């Protein structure tokens, strides 16, 4: 499993001169039942954006295993695919938590705060929580479960560093 990084431009042709309306980068990461995409668009003639994407074969909130699960995987932002995701979900207690470590920018290595495991509008198991650095809230994260045994998790997080919000992709698998 590798993170694929891409550069891209969207161009139009006007008077026989290709013109770039926007440019950017995106990283994609595939596991067995899920995929995540971060994406950064710049308008090359409200300026830059963070678009994320998340999808796969969602786990049904009414079909979760008993007990507890441990997950391990990757965290990635723009240039940085080195992050490491750790996460635990207690299914009996409808609760999850975890952390991000080893992104080159220290302030992106955030706790994924304890958060409730609930059902989304399609009755899929999901977790929405805060990101933390120290004891200060710094953003939110959105985690969905994937696979019929909830083998996988994937989603994304957001961190405010200075006055710029960063956006991190996160995906993991159960240890065995």
């Amino acid at each position, epitope marked *: 499993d590798k993170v694929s990084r891409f550069d891209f431009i969207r161009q139009i042709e006007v008077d026989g001169q290709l013109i770039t309306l926007e440019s950017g980068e995106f990283q994609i990461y595939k596991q067995d039942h899920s995929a995540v995409v971060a994406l950064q668009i710049e308008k090359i003639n409200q300026r830059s954006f963070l678009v994320s994407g998340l999808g796969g074969e969602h786990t049904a909130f009414n079909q979760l295993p008993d007990g507890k699960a441990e997950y391990h995987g990757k965290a990635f932002s723009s240039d940085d695919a080195g992050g490491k995701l750790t996460y635990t979900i207690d299914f009996a207690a409808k609760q999850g938590h975890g952390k991000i470590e080893h992104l080159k920018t220290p302030e992106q290595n955030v706790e994924l705060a304890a958060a409730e495991l*609930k059902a989304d509008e399609k009755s899929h198991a999901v977790i929405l929580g805060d990101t933390r650095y120290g004891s200060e809230e710094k953003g939110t994260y959105h985690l969905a479960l994937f696979g019929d045994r909830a083998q996988e998790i994937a989603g994304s997080a957001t961190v405010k560093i200075g006055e710029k919000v960063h956006e991190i992709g996160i995906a993991g698998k159960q240890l065995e």
Partner: antibody, heavy 117, light 110 residues
Framework: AEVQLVESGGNLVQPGGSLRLSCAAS????????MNWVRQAPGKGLEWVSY????????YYADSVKGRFTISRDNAKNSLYLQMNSLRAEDTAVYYC?????????WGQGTLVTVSS | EIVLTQSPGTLSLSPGERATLSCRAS???????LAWYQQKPGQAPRLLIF???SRATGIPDRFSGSGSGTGFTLTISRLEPEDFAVYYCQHYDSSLPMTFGQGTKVEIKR
């Protein structure tokens, strides 16, 4: 489509008697959540009573009631129950039904049990 | 076994002031499984903090929790009047019978 819990069954019973509490749940897929009984004697703190998991594979009882009470649930009728026997005076309390959801997030209003001759 | 001891018994503070409540565990516990509840006369308990430091749905931001190991803390930054109540901590690890602390009362000092 909000969550609700409604205990019933509370009542007067003589010491050594027996009483069966009920809890009707709506607003969520009852068969997906662990539930608890918690009780409060008059003017006293909360005392956790018993726990049971979604599927009934895991049950706990407080030291104070281990023996005399039995928890169970019927997912078809979206109901939780608490069978009490050998009731003593110290079991006089309000009995709450509660849903485990990143903590005890949803509580019914309670049913009052009095145990007295 | 796990016993939860709260302190102090009564906290007397004026509105606006900062309130700091303590929950001590007899053994080390996972921070995942310490919760705080609020209770007012005639009402069912209400979940304030779950997972040691996460606020329950719809819970104002002035309630924060912290701690680890055997020592946990519930902080109310500015005490509104609807905040004077009884507060309980609870261990709810799903692999163990649960337990409540004996609770603390934050009364209005005048």
């Amino acid at each position: 489509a909000e969550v609700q819990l409604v205990e019933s069954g509370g009542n007067l019973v003589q010491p050594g008697g027996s009483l069966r509490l009920s809890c009707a749940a709506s607003g969520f897929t009852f068969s997906s959540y662990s539930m608890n009984w918690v009780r409060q004697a008059p003017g006293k703190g909360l005392e956790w009573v018993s726990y049971i998991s979604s599927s009934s594979s895991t049950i706990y009882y407080a030291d104070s009631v281990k023996g005399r009470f039995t928890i169970s649930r019927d997912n078809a009728k979206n109901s939780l129950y608490l069978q009490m026997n050998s009731l003593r005076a110290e079991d006089t309390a309000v009995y709450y039904c509660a849903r485990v959801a990143a903590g005890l997030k949803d509580w019914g209003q309670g049913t009052l049990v009095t145990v007295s001759s | 076994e796990i016993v939860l001891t709260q302190s102090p018994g009564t906290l007397s503070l004026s509105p606006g002031e900062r309130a700091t409540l303590s929950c001590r565990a007899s053994q080390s516990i996972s921070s995942s499984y310490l919760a705080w509840y609020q209770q007012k006369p005639g009402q069912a308990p209400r979940l304030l903090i779950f997972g040691a430091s996460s606020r329950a749905t719809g819970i104002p931001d002035r309630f924060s929790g912290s701690g680890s190991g055997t020592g946990f803390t519930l902080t109310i930054s500015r005490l509104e009047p609807e905040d004077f109540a009884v507060y309980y901590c609870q261990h709810y690890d799903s692999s163990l019978p649960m337990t409540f602390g004996q609770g603390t009362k934050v009364e209005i000092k005048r």
